[PDB]
Amino acid sequence: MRTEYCGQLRLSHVGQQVTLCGWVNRRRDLGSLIFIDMRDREGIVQVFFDPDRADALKLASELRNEFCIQVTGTVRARDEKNINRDMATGEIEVLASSLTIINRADVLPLDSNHVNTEEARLKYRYLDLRRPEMAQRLKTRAKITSLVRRFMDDHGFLDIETPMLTKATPEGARDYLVPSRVHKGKFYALPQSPQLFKQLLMMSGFDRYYQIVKCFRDEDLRADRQPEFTQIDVETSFMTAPQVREVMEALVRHLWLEVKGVDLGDFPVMTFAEAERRYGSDKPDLRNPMELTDVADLLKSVEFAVFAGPANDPKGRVAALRVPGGASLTRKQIDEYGNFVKIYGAKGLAYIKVNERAKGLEGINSPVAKFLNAEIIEDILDRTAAQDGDMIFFGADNKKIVADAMGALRLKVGKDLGLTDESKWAPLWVIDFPMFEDDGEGGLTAMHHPFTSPKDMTAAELKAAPENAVANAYDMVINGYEVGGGSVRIHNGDMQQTVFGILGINEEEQREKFGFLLDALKYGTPPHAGLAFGLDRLTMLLTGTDNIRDVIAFPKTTAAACLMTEAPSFANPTALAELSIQVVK
RNA sequence: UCCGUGAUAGUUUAAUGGUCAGAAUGGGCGCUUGUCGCGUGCCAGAUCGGGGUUCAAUUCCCCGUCGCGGAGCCA
Numbered sequence: 032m033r034t035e036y037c038g039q040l041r042l043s044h045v046g047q048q049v050t051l052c053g054w055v056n057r058r059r060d061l062g063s064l065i066f067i068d069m070r071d072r073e074g075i076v077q078v079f080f081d082p083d084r085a086d087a088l089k090l091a092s093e094l095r096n097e098f099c100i101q102v103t104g105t106v107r108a109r110d111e112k113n114i115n116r117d118m119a120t121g122e123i124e125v126l127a128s129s130l131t132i133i134n135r136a137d138v139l140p141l142d143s144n145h146v147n148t149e150e151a152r153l154k155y156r157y158l159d160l161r162r163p164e165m166a167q168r169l170k171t172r173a174k175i176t177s178l179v180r181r182f183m184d185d186h187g188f189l190d191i192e193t194p195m196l197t198k199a200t201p202e203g204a205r206d207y208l209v210p211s212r213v214h215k216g217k218f219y220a221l222p223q224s225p226q227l228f229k230q231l232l233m234m235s236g237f238d239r240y241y242q243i244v245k246c247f248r249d250e251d252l253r254a255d256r257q258p259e260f261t262q263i264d265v266e267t268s269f270m271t272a273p274q275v276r277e278v279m280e281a282l283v284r285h286l287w288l289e290v291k292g293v294d295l296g297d298f299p300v301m302t303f304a305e306a307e308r309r310y311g312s313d314k315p316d317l318r319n320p321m322e323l324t325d326v327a328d329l330l331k332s333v334e335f336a337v338f339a340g341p342a343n344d345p346k347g348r349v350a351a352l353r354v355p356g357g358a359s360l361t362r363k364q365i366d367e368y369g370n371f372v373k374i375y376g377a378k379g380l381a382y383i384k385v386n387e388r389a390k391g392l393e394g395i396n397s398p399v400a401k402f403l404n405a406e407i408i409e410d411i412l413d414r415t416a417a418q419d420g421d422m423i424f425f426g427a428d429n430k431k432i433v434a435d436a437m438g439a440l441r442l443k444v445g446k447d448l449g450l451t452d453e454s455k456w457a458p459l460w461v462i463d464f465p466m467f468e469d470d471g472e473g474g475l476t477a478m479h480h481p482f483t484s485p486k487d488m489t490a491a492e493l494k495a496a497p498e499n500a501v502a503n504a505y506d507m508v509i510n511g512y513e514v515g516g517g518s519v520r521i522h523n524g525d526m527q528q529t530v531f532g533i534l535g536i537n538e539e540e541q542r543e544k545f546g547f548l549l550d551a552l553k554y555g556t557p558p559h560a561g562l563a564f565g566l567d568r569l570t571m572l573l574t575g576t577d578n579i580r581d582v583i584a585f586p587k588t589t590a591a592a593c594l595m596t597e598a599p600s601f602a603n604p605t606a607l608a609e610l611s612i613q614v615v616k
Numbered sequence: 617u618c619c620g621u622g623a624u625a626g627u628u629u630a631a632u633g634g635u636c637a638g639a640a641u642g643g644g645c646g647c648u649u650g651u652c653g654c655g656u657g658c659c660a661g662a663u664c665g666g667g668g669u670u671c672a673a674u675u676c677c678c679c680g681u682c683g684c685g686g687a688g689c690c691a
């Protein structure tokens with residue numbers, strides 16, 4: 032019933048009589064003249080009202096912000112003097128000839144003139160979406176899923192939906208349950224991912240699978256984690272890790288080219304180890320020129336426990352972080368970080384201010400130089416390539432803390448000091464993650480998941496040297512975000528049992544929770560491997576946010592709630608009756 | 617579960633142990649023929665819950681509630 036979208040009107044439409052549908056973005060009543068900025072998904076147009084069209088001018092008097100209206104008029108140009116060089120429809124305006132108010136809007140819970148609170152934006156998400164900046168991100172999402180499916184189809188992947196009311200799939204997180212009314216006492220599990228099912232689809236013979244799916248993990252949030260998120264899930268048969276990475280890297284290289292006009296180039300490949308080593312993170316943000324430099328060897332003989340303990344401990348590490356120009360840091364700045372590294376378990380944070388390297392010791396300033404010496408200090412500077420003006424922090428504890436603390440620090444200092452080049456893109460693959468990690472209760476846990484194949488290893492070899500075992504798994508990271516992760520699957524019942532075993536899953540359980548899989552591995556399973564992207568995160572990077580909820584139409588709070596609909600909600604007593612369940616007192 | 621931070625008109629948010637709780641935007645009624653952050657005049661517009669301290673609490677303390685960030689947890 033509309034004949035054009037407000038935002039699409041241009042000088043070319045001059046003369047066109049049009050019927051616009053939308054909302055009032057702004058009302059300017061100059062008494063005899065009313066200027067209404069009409070808006071719809073495409074933009075804003077200025078409709079003009081004047082004394083000729085009496086009733087219209089009068090009715091227009093009633094208009095308020097966000098009123099839902101319809102207007103029919105004619106597109107005329109504006110005199111040079113009235114042109115708005117800051118609006119797409121700027122050279123034009125539509126002279127109203129008729130105005131109809133479909134609906135009025137009560138006062139808005141969100142003032143359209145200023146950065147509203149998150150809590151408010153969420154509670155009234157639908158009004159918040161009306162903002163171009165926000166609506167735009169959802170359009171770019173759509174452009175992404177369109178580009179994705181077309182790319183995947185052209186590469187012969189079949190888009191297959193998997194079950195939501197299903198069995199428990201181990202992705203690491205906690206499972207959301209769903210009690211059965213008909214089968215009382217038993218529940219379903221919302222999928223943490225279609226993992227087990229896509230593997231079965233490979234065993235079924237579909238050769239290449241993919242799906243844009245909703246995944247559910249009952250864990251706590253973060254700016255890049257929602258308990259319900261969307262993955263671009265993919266799986267293949269008869270393909271190696273390299274081949275999988277190749278086509279996955281091509282999808283992404285393709286997304287950036289079509290959405291940002293940027294050619295990401297060939298992705299660098301780095302091992303889990305090289306990563307933790309140079310950046311103490313398996314999601315290295317390569318836009319940051321800084322990196323950890325180890326210096327334990329240099330400090331084994333030093334009579335300073337803080338350094339000597341970790342330097343002479345196999346489990347310990349001593350990493351120096353050279354922050355360019357960081358000598359300027361204030362004593363309170365050096366303290367905020369000192370506290371910051373504590374968040375990750377670091378006891379302290381020693382430093383060395385490099386003022387004049389040529390002047391030797393009298394050229395530097397550090398509360399620990401009395402424990403080091405002219406030569407040790409020079410080695411450390413030479414190593415880190417530290418020069419006049421720079422600072423050098425140190426992290427000394429067990430490998431893990433040094434990595435976590437100094438890893439975090441490296442990012443923080445980088446952003447604070449404006450060292451991190453946010454002008455570019457840093458894609459890369461991180462490969463060879465270990466197969467297992469210390470679970471903390473004496474056992475082990477699967478890094479990626481229990482259906483991940485070891486890089487070159489026999490069920491017998493794994494069952495013997497598990498802790499060491501390198502998984503044939505890979506992660507794609509961009510600008511510090513782990514936007515995708517995958518692995519070559521275990522297509523061998525023998526292997527699958529050895530793994531369940533190492534992960535301490537007894538037979539009874541192997542049968543209760545993974546029986547269908549252990550049996551399916553008996554019918555000629557092909558070699559298979561896959562990977563899943565975090566669609567949300569991929570959109571964040573492509574729409575320029577750092578907030579995952581900014582790319583999800585209806586996000587949840589860090590407390591897993593939906594303010595706009597106030598959910599979850601207390602259930603009806605009889606509802607729970609038919610569910611054979613009761614809340615615990 | 618924990619740490620950090622915030623809680624004041626519709627909204628964003630200033631201040632404050634005793635008083636005039638300030639502004640912008642927004643709302644109501646005027647005036648106003650080229651505005652586009654319209655301008656302008658009058659009117660109305662608020663201190664999260666419980667407890668505590670205190671002569672007195674929006675303000676101080678504790679607890680609880682909720683948003684955000686982070687830890688744990690979770691790729």
Ligand SMILES: Nc1ncnc2c1ncn2[C@@H]1O[C@H](COP(=O)(O)OC(=O)[C@@H](N)CC(=O)O)[C@@H](O)[C@H]1O
Pocket residue numbers: 202223224225226248255256257258259260261262265513514515516517518561562563564565566567568691
């Ligand atoms: N809570 C979350 N909120 C938002 N995004 C999330 C969340 N959790 C994960 N992601 C994103 O999804 C990618 C794939 O998930 P994975 O856990 O790596 O593995 C899986 O789901 C395997 N089945 C994939 C495979 O083996 O093929 C992650 O890289 C990440 O960007």
